[PDB]
Design brief:
With 78 residues, this protein is an all-alpha fold. It has four helices and no strands. The structure holds one DNA strand of 60 nucleotides. Belongs to the RAG1 family.
DNA sequence: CGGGTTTTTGTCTGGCTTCACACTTGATTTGCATCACTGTGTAAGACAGGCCAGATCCAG
């Protein structure tokens, strides 16, 4: 917070990417980049909105599907 | 119109990873084209024509 402005999460993921590249890995690096950016392993709200609308899903139906996926998989895809 | 002072970076430098890259063939798994059909088209209004009724007219 003294000289680097004061953003904690930024320094955190930067140090993690540096320590990861130290191990010269690309798989994990790309995974965390996609997670932190919001492009892989998890849909944007507009994307799931388009899916729910263009497939005629009811709100109740969509909630049922969301609940089932979250219960079985354990990871929030929608 | 271009001098100071940190940012922003590709290297120099050579030596350690973790993935990349030739071949099979028999499956196994995805991806995509094809075919006979579907729904949404969904109540009233204008006009001519036959028919008596009753008004319009005729003549003893």
């Amino acid at each position: 917070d003294k000289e680097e402005g004061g953003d904690v999460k930024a320094v955190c993921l930067t140090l993690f990417l540096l320590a990861l590249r130290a191990r010269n890995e690309h798989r994990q690096a790309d995974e965390l980049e996609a997670i932190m950016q919001g492009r892989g392993s998890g849909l944007q709200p507009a994307v799931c909105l388009a899916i729910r609308v263009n497939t005629f899903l009811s709100c109740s139906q969509y909630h049922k599907m969301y609940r089932t996926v979250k219960a079985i998989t354990g990871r929030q895809i929608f």
